[PDB]
Symmetry: D2
Subunit: 308 residues, 4 copies
């Protein structure tokens, strides 16, 4: 299927491996905020909290779409290659998710690389989800059940959080939504990785992916950890999964294989491919119909635990 | 790959010399097994008679809650233009109604070969138009009507939007096409040949050719845009959600239809469900993909996400 | 992903009545012909009496001998463009590598001669070669048909016509990214690779060719226009070459498959990283050289049979 | 779709706890059926002993015609680095020799588990270098040597080209990789999972995992570029022809390898054979795809068409 015409038009606008992390971070915030502002999403209540993690205080933003106790809970991890982003760059997606799902969304401001190498973000991701499950009365959410959700690098963090919970014999993760996740962080190529990582696709080029990996990892061998590459994990007894992939996305192949691999272990799991679009398309919902459709789908899937 | 549960299911005889009544009986019986295992509730449900140009059209109205000015979905069941009824898709409609908050009106359009094309197309338009016109008796909002259908009914849904468009009418605000047949000529796509071998069971080459013979008076009739909406003018059509399945003969054409809508300025989204075959939505009591699809469909209609 | 050198070849390609488009196709093709600079032992032009009048054909003979194998070749060009001259290099190289006499047919071009003018010429020339083997020094029982793109269509249709008459002079068919469905019925590849970025065969160019070829668009429904709708039984064994980034890729590969369903031995090979028309670029494109080498050797040994 | 006859061939039917010798016997026996039905002629053939670093290596020399300074092909049989011999691919080597005009030297490299990685790799390079060094004894042209191999043998061919390059040697002018394994880690591609279920028989998920356990001392060794050449520096390698199969687990990595070669300025062609599975070349007596492949490969070597 071809690129959606509008996306084709949006892509015609003009990164380097030598740029410093700070500059790239600032541009990614600036660019992200354009989308947030055009979304202009409402939210009934929102506040930032500090969650005590292993590596220090973790900032989280709590989006509450309505009044009431024992509300459903989503722990959300923003994308950005493990290097970029924050709760600010995905704020609109979280608000809309909250409002459509009726769930309290807790978006976790995990530690970024290269300052905090793998597994810093993984630790924060687990610590924050566990904190939400354990401190439900402070938040007015369900006792010790959450859905985990995230996009791209955040989809990795969602999958691995589920895995870490399973490895610790914890049962608080009830549902997982992986939005075009990176599940193999080794340098091993898939057809989609090579096919859609050319400069022409902009958002996730080969050069950028290589750069993210150099920031994320302290040593090559860490890419082989199942907490880095969850596609190498034992996938039994993981919670039901929705995996969203994009057609013209380097991570498409591995995303679709993860869903299948989940099923081979008897986990209920659905993979859906959005045609016509690139990696990261959910954040463009104000101007891409596919983004709106995905947020609708993700919300309703969480609300009813449709895959379970 | 095919979902593991689906591989087990697909393990196990249609003939092109079967008489329509037999195929109809077996289709209803199989379908009803799925309806029973779903065991869906509904607040209110009534069967009505819509007076169509070609005669009386039975429809089933599923009301999931109380209130006037509820949104509505006109639903067209699949079955090759030859099989099925409101009964065969009753679970899907109740579940759609419940999740969407919308009144679902499922249409028992006339079947081929007794009523060849364009009988069912004309009934599909009449039924949808009747729902619009009689919004008050239904307690539905005439400004919030969607059309939806699976397979052949996905065709009838798409064509109904076209028919309304051609008459300058605006009562279809949204269309959800669940693995629709949009090119009824024998022109192949890669998917049409790839997933139509006997081992896929549900929509085989033999089965497709047989539907075609039942539906049309002459094979050339498939060249009509009311038969093959992929050949229609597609401008000024309502926003569309197209659901496709990975292992589906109709996959390519449905994804192509979504794309062609976009090229005419119509907002449209194609989503492919991996590891599943044509017809998988009706299998939702046992396929997670099915449940996810109904969830997706209902929410997309409820919020008109694609618009 | 596209071959990098083919990226650079397309970036340098951007950088209309039929006459002008014809002349530009001729001029740029000749660049490739000259850079190939292929030798040939003997070459001369003949005049084949066809139903529609005389048909120019070029005979490439690679060696001395009577009873040589024969290939009737039909050039591409969307039924509107091209000539024996635009594909001279490909034909010379095919003959040298195969050892076969190649008879390239200068079939009548649209819009001057609408469908089925070229179909009629393609059949008449293939038959003439079969009938006139002695004056050619060829074996009338070792004739293959071959052609690229529109010429691929002509070769498939010529084989169908012979079949319809119960004639057996066509023993092998090599369809080089053929167009087998000329209707507006879409395939995924037709839409996927027909954007401006691919240059050689864009949607606009395909539509333009269709308007030139057909007197009315519904003529595409004829099985002599769209051989994918023909009965495919008892046709000669086939080699079908497709290109990965080609609108016609799906239908080419569908055609090979449907031959198999009817009991015809048939092989479909897809060349990765390349676009429609890649064979003619062989002097600067490794896929092109490989394809000519494969086609020539397949013909020589009738490997698929 | 699968070629209909291949669908038949497959339908006429390994377990991960079988011992190496039983699987070797069964592989040899079944291979020899195909060798017998080809019944290829050869002008001259004899077995020689090549002194490798790790000991004596049997090679079979197929000479298709008279003359000194004939071109040469060093050929490595497939079999997962565990099965096979010069015997199992004898027909393919004879036919390749006759069609190419080249002397073919099929190398009986050491098999795992007895001789783990990098035993076969060292034998492969040593045999090829020996051919280049002893060109006068074989009557070949030391400036027209190609490497070739199928599956595991395609890996060995690829890696031999890399080893020659790493030593500043230039005796490998051409490489033909027939559905090679170029990534021996457990990292998946779409094709690896898609076509590795039991219904494909020839190269299943269980068989692939079993081969990886035999070949490697420790699992990390697969990260070596001499085991997984797709991770190697690919600059300054010889021109490549890569043959893939549509319904093959190794399809994706094979196509990726040809492209990676291109990114480093090496001339390379990847061609996908449709309708067929891994190993299809050895089936040429009964598969048109097999005969076409042998024709293609031999002609490409003869003229060094990709160069």
């Amino acid at each position: 299927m071809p690129l959606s015409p509008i996306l084709r038009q949006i892509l015609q606008q003009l990164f380097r491996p030598d740029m410093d992390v700070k500059t790239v971070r600032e541009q990614f915030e600036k660019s992200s905020l354009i989308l947030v502002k055009m979304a202009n999403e409402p939210i009934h209540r929102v506040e930032d909290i500090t969650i005590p993690g292993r590596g220090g205080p973790i900032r989280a933003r709590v989006y509450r779409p309505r009044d009431g106790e024992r509300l459903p809970a989503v722990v959300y991890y923003h994308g950005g290659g493990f290097v970029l982003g924050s709760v600010e760059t995905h704020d609109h997606v979280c608000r809309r998710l909250a409002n459509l799902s009726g769930a309290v969304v807790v978006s976790v401001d995990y530690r970024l690389a290269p300052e905090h190498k793998f597994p810093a973000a993984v630790e924060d991701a687990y610590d924050a989800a566990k904190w939400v499950a354990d401190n439900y009365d402070k938040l007015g959410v369900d006792n010790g059940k959450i859905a985990v959700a995230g996009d791209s690098a955040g989809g990795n963090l969602a999958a691995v959080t589920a895995i870490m919970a399973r490895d610790r014999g914890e049962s608080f993760v009830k549902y997982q939504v992986l939005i075009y996740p990176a599940v193999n962080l080794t340098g091993s190529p898939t057809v989609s990785r090579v096919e859609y990582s050319g400069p022409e696709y902009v958002i996730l080029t080969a050069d950028l992916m290589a750069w993210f990996g150099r920031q994320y990892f302290s040593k090559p061998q860490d890419a082989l950890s199942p907490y880095a590459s969850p596609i190498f994990a034992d996938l039994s007894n993981l919670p039901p999964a929705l995996v969203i992939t994009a057609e013209y996305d380097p991570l498409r192949d591995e995303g679709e294989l993860y869903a299948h691999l989940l099923k081979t272990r008897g986990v209920r799991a659905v993979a859906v491919r959005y045609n016509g679009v690139i990696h990261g398309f959910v954040n463009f919902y104000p101007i891409l119909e596919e983004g709106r459709e995905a947020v609708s789908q993700i919300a309703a899937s969480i609300k009813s635990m449709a895959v379970a």
